[PDB]
Design an enzyme around this catalytic site. Structure first.
Site, PDB file in Angstrom:
ATOM      1  CE  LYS A 164     -10.709  -4.160   2.966  1.00 28.64           C
ATOM      2  NZ  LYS A 164     -10.321  -3.382   1.786  1.00 28.64           N
ATOM      3  CD  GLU A 176      -2.871   1.104   0.195  1.00 29.41           C
ATOM      4  OE1 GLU A 176      -3.850   0.324   0.204  1.00 29.41           O
ATOM      5  OE2 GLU A 176      -2.637   1.924  -0.730  1.00 29.41           O
ATOM      6  CG  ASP A 191      -3.553  -3.179   2.508  1.00 29.86           C
ATOM      7  OD1 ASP A 191      -3.501  -2.329   1.579  1.00 29.86           O
ATOM      8  OD2 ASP A 191      -4.596  -3.567   3.057  1.00 29.86           O
TER       9      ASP A 191
HETATM   10  O1  LIG Z   1      -8.471  -1.433   2.714  1.00 30.39           O
HETATM   11  C1  LIG Z   1      -8.265  -0.482   2.015  1.00 30.39           C
HETATM   12  N1  LIG Z   1      -9.123   0.528   2.052  1.00 30.39           N
HETATM   13  C2  LIG Z   1      -8.884   1.628   1.329  1.00 30.39           C
HETATM   14  C3  LIG Z   1      -9.941   2.682   1.446  1.00 30.39           C
HETATM   15  C4  LIG Z   1     -10.148   3.550   0.373  1.00 30.39           C
HETATM   16  C5  LIG Z   1     -11.169   4.487   0.451  1.00 30.39           C
HETATM   17  C6  LIG Z   1     -11.988   4.514   1.563  1.00 30.39           C
HETATM   18  C7  LIG Z   1     -13.106   5.516   1.639  1.00 30.39           C
HETATM   19  N2  LIG Z   1     -13.734   6.120   0.619  1.00 30.39           N
HETATM   20  N3  LIG Z   1     -14.670   6.914   1.164  1.00 30.39           N
HETATM   21  N4  LIG Z   1     -14.641   6.779   2.493  1.00 30.39           N
HETATM   22  N5  LIG Z   1     -13.673   5.891   2.770  1.00 30.39           N
HETATM   23  C8  LIG Z   1     -11.802   3.635   2.623  1.00 30.39           C
HETATM   24  C9  LIG Z   1     -10.779   2.690   2.558  1.00 30.39           C
HETATM   25  N6  LIG Z   1      -7.849   1.759   0.481  1.00 30.39           N
HETATM   26  C10 LIG Z   1      -6.964   0.732   0.409  1.00 30.39           C
HETATM   27  C11 LIG Z   1      -7.165  -0.400   1.149  1.00 30.39           C
HETATM   28  O2  LIG Z   1      -6.273  -1.454   1.100  1.00 30.39           O
HETATM   29 MN   LIG Z   2      -6.529  -2.512   2.964  1.00 30.30          MN
HETATM   30 MN   LIG Z   3      -4.651  -1.656  -0.132  1.00 35.34          MN
END
Ligand SMILES: O=c1[nH]c(-c2ccc(-c3nnn[nH]3)cc2)ncc1O
Ligand SMILES: [Mn+2]
Ligand SMILES: [Mn+2]
EC number: 3.1.-.-
Length: 200
Positions: free
Chosen positions: A139, A85, A113
């Site tokens: 997930k 990530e 990640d």
């Molecule tokens: O697990 C991951 N999650 C997220 C994530 C992205 C956007 C949001 C979000 N968008 N609007 N509100 N929250 C929450 C989590 N990104 C990467 C991940 O591995």
């Molecule tokens: Mn994640």
């Molecule tokens: Mn991620």
């Protein structure tokens, strides 16, 4: 009290490195950090949890896992985790392919990640403003690949992880939970939390 801006909260309360990486991630996906502000904060939070999960965890000369919190780890130690990530898409897949061809571990279909060199598995980190179980299930359904380990944190101290295997010691996971509590409390003092929670 007065309503603060989520922008101000993010820039004041996350390290600049994290904020920059979050900005870079939103740009890459065509999202504006100044309009999708709850998203911006969620992306920062998740990135920070990924870094905290990996912080201080090494593998020693004897090939075993050790924790070194002083900022001077002896040179023969190797980082326990690869962080996936936070990297742009090309570099993230480059790192994943490297691991997968090296370790023999199967290739995930979506970017995870972290990679854990001790447990020899990819990890998907989740941070949720909802019930960890519902979120765990979501997930898992996206992953469909028995190999990637899932570890979910909430803002209220609940965790859920694949096969009740939590990977890290209690103190490490307590650091993460304490940080999430701090974020929630600070958002709440700025009257940002209810919205932030409800927006997931
Ligand atoms: O697990 C991951 N999650 C997220 C994530 C992205 C956007 C949001 C979000 N968008 N609007 N509100 N929250 C929450 C989590 N990104 C990467 C991940 O591995
Ligand atoms: Mn994640
Ligand atoms: Mn991620």
């Amino acid at each position: 009290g007065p309503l603060g801006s989520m922008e101000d909260f993010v820039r004041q309360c996350f390290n600049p490195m994290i904020v920059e990486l979050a900005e870079k991630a939103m740009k890459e996906y065509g999202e504006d950090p100044k309009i999708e502000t709850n998203k911006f904060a969620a992306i920062c939070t998740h990135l920070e949890v990924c870094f905290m999960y990996s912080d201080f965890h090494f593998i020693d000369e004897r090939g075993e896992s050790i924790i070194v919190e002083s900022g001077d780890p002896n040179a023969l130690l190797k980082h326990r985790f690869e962080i996936i990530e936070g990297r742009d898409r090309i570099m993230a897949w480059t790192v994943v392919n490297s691991i997968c061809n090296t370790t023999g571990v199967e290739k995930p279909k979506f970017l995870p990640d972290l990679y854990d060199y001790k447990e020899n598995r990819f990890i998907e980190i989740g941070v949720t403003r909802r019930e960890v179980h519902i979120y765990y299930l979501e997930k898992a359904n996206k992953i469909k690949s028995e190999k990637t380990h899932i570890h979910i944190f909430s803002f209220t101290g609940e965790e859920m992880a694949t096969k009740a295997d939590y990977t890290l010691d209690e103190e490490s996971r307590a650091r993460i939970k304490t940080r999430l509590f701090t974020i929630r409390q600070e958002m709440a003092s700025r009257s940002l939390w209810d919205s932030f929670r409800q927006s997931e």
